[PDB]
Amino acid sequence: MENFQKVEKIGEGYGVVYKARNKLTGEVVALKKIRLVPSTAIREISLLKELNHPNIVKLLDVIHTENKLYLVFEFLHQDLKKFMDASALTGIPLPLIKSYLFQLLQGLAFCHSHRVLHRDLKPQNLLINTEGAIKLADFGLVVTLWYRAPEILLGCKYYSTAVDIWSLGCIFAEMVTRRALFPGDSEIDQLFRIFRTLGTPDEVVWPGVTSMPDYKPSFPKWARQDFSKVVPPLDEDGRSLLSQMLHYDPNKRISAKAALAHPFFQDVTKPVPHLRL
Ligand SMILES: CN(C)CCCOc1ccc(Nc2cc(-n3cnc4ccccc43)ncn2)nc1
């Protein structure tokens, strides 16, 4: 750790993230210092060192010395939240939205084939570079609830890869409309904003929903709205894909693999963003 010169704090993950410079090699890195280490965590983290993909932020090194754990990652120059904020007047161009969605689906398909879930996707942990890449960071082992799948909010203990597809669907919608789709500020507010837009789920659209730990018979019954109203700028292919990413039933929700084959991507390309660094 004496090996690293902290340049600036750039975020908060289970810890704070700094831009740092390796004092010996000259490498500029993102250094995550983890909040207070269990034998189980060390071994689980070391496996993530082998989960390498073009659309996953590269974990360069794990430094367990001595009670704290630091994760040394490759440095990317901007997060998607900042890029969306910087693009808010005109919006991110559709071709670039589509490229980013496709690449994140590639990252997830990879993670999910190895039975690794992200669990907390959000614009703040999606990182972009000047050559058009976007990468997943901060794979979990005031908290934002906006991207949380309904099965998590309803108390499902053993949720699936489908949670990440839900989160990515919410992020897709946001890139398109330039407003967060479900900006809840508590778990029930989040759940009711989902219900208000997509309809209160029942046994018809989600078999077993009424048996979920935090499901109440007394939830209000809202009707579903149209996706034409929810993401107006999006063409029918994007809306179709989005609707599949936001299916209530995690077993009907589209997989990352299947989503890559969606007709929305027939004309996918890799534009380069205009980034102000
Ligand atoms: C100073 N703030 C006003 C700026 C706001 C945020 O701006 C930036 C600019 C550049 C980067 N770069 C990164 C970050 C990561 N990373 C690894 N685990 C993470 C967990 C959370 C977030 C990022 C995480 N990995 C590689 N590159 N991250 C944020």
Neighbours of 202 (CB within 10 A): 13
Locate tokens 């209160």: which residue?
A: 200
Q: Please give the C-alpha separations between residue 125 and each of 3, 25, 56, 80, 103, in angstroms, as whole numbers.
A: 25, 26, 11, 8, 14
Collect all residues with Cβ–Cβ distance below 8 Å to 87 and sequence separation of at least 6: 178
Q: How many residues does the chain have?
A: 277
Resolution in A: 1.8
Q: What are phi and psi of 236, to 5 degrees?
A: -60, -35
> 228-266 burial, b if ≥16 CB within 10 A, otherwise e?
eebbeebeeebbbbbebbbbbebeebbbbeebbebebbe
Angle, to 10 degrees, between the axis of helix 162-177 and the axis of helix 94-113?
Answer: 170
Residue 227 region, left (φ>0) first, then alpha (ψ -120 to 50), else beta? alpha
Residue 18 region, left (φ>0) first, then alpha (ψ -120 to 50), else beta? beta
d(CA 115, CA 171): 22
Domains and CATH numbers, the chain: 1-77 (3.30.200.20), 78-275 (1.10.510.10)
Q: Which of 120, 185, 226, 235 is catalytic?
A: 120
d(CA 51, CA 77): 22
97 touches 49 (CB < 8 A): no
What would the two tokens of residue 232 be?
């107006």
Q: What are phi and psi of 12, to 5 degrees?
A: -135, 115
Task: Tell which atom from ligand 1 comes closest to the C-alpha of 12.
Answer: 21
Nearest to 59 by CA among 23, 34, 84, 83: 34
Q: Whose C-alpha lies nearest to ligand 1, atom 22?
A: 125
Strand partners, 61: 72
What would the two tokens of residue 150 be?
């309904």
Kindly give the distance from the C-alpha atom of residue 133 to the centroid of ligand 1, in angstroms, as a whole number: 15
Collect all residues with Cβ–Cβ distance below 8 Å to 215 and sequence separation of at least 6: 154, 155, 209
Q: Please give the C-alpha separations between residue 272 and each of 92, 130, 194, in angstroms, as whole numbers.
A: 11, 7, 33
- The full 3-state SS of 96-165, as one line of letters, equals HHHHHHHHHHHHHHHHHHCCCCCCCCCHHHEEECCCCCEEECCCCCCCCCCCCCHHHHCCCCCCCCHHHH
Task: Tell which atom from ligand 1 comes closest to the C-alpha of 8.
Answer: 1
Locate tokens 């190895």: which residue?
A: 114
Kindly give the distance from the C-alpha atom of residue 232 to the centroid of ligand 1, in angstroms, as a whole number: 31
Kindly give the distance from the C-alpha atom of residue 174 to the centroid of ligand 1, in angstroms, as a whole number: 20
Looking only at the bridges linking them, the beta strands covering 15-22 and 78-79 are unpaired
Kindly give the distance from the C-alpha atom of residue 30 to the centroid of ligand 1, in angstroms, as a whole number: 7
Collect all residues with Cβ–Cβ distance below 8 Å to 194 and sequence separation of at least 6: 150, 153, 182, 184
Q: What are phi and psi of 112, to 5 degrees?
A: -65, -30
First CA to last CA across the chain, in angstroms?
A: 27
Residues with CB under 6 A from ligand 1: 8, 10-11, 13, 17, 30, 32, 57, 73, 75-79, 82, 124-125, 127, 137-138
d(CA 57, CA 76): 8
120 is catalytic: yes
DSSP secondary structure letters along the chain: -TTEEEEEEEEE--EEEEEEEETTT--EEEEEEE----HHHHHHHHHHTT---TTB--EEEEEE-SSSEEEEEE--SEEHHHHHHHTTTT---HHHHHHHHHHHHHHHHHHHHTT-------GGGEEE-TTS-EEE---------TT--HHHHTT-SS--THHHHHHHHHHHHHHHHSS-S---SSHHHHHHHHHHHH----TTTSTTGGGSTT--TTS--PPPPPHHHHSTTS-HHHHHHHHHHT-SSTTTSPPHHHHHTSGGGTT----------
* Positive or negative torsion for Cα 66, 67, 68, 74: positive
Q: What are phi and psi of 61, to 5 degrees?
A: -160, 150
Kindly give the distance from the C-alpha atom of residue 12 to the centroid of ligand 1, in angstroms, as a whole number: 8
Q: Whose C-alpha lies nearest to ligand 1, atom 29?
A: 10
Which residue among 8, 12, 17, 34 is best mutated to probe the pocket of ligand 1, counting the most ligand atoms within 8 A of its Cβ? 17
Task: Tell which atom from ligand 1 comes closest to the C-alpha of 76.
Answer: 27
Task: Tell which atom from ligand 1 comes closest to the C-alpha of 77.
Answer: 10
Collect all residues with Cβ–Cβ distance below 8 Å to 78 and sequence separation of at least 6: 127, 128, 275, 277
Residue numbers in the known binding site are: 10-17, 32, 74-76, 79, 122-125, 138
Neighbours of 24 (CB within 10 A): 9
Q: How was this structure determined?
A: X-ray
